């Protein structure tokens, strides 16, 4: 022990119609991602997956949380519950319902999300925070 138990390893958006991949390797510099941004077309379905392990033990009350601010405005709060997880060698994958990017022109540009992977004894096992950009085309 510093032998973790949880290490939350990557955020994927998951879109059908995207033209690439948007990952985020969380095991990596966080501090880089508020220089990065991923595009989203306006009005897209996607959903948000987190990559994470469990090394040693059943956490439970699992809950990803997401805080969502335009030019440091908080906007949005949405918390999604993710359960209860045991220990394994391969690596859990958590994925959102469906979200759908905003529409129109006032509603486009670079959003800010703060990312928190936490528990029902609010651990913070890993806290992130990266930029969702809405635009009218790929």
């Given at each position: 022990a510093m032998v973790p138990n949880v290490v939350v390893t990557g955020l994927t958006l998951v879109?059908?119609?995207?033209?690439?991949p948007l990952e985020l390797?969380?095991?990596?510099?966080?501090?880089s991602f508020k220089k990065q941004s991923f595009v989203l077309k306006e009005g897209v379905e996607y959903r948000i997956k987190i990559s994470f392990r469990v090394n040693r033990e059943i956490v439970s009350g699992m809950k990803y949380i997401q805080h969502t601010y335009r030019y440091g405005v908080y906007i949005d709060y949405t918390d999604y519950m993710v359960g209860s997880y045991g220990p394994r060698a391969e690596e859990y994958e958590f994925l959102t319902p469906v979200e759908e990017a905003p529409k129109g022109m006032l509603a486009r540009g670079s959003y800010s999300i703060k990312s928190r992977f936490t528990d029902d004894d609010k651990t913070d096992h890993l806290s992130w925070e990266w930029n969702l950009t809405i635009k009218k085309d790929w």
């Open positions: 879109c059908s119609s995207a033209p690439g390797d969380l095991t990596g510099d966080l501090e």
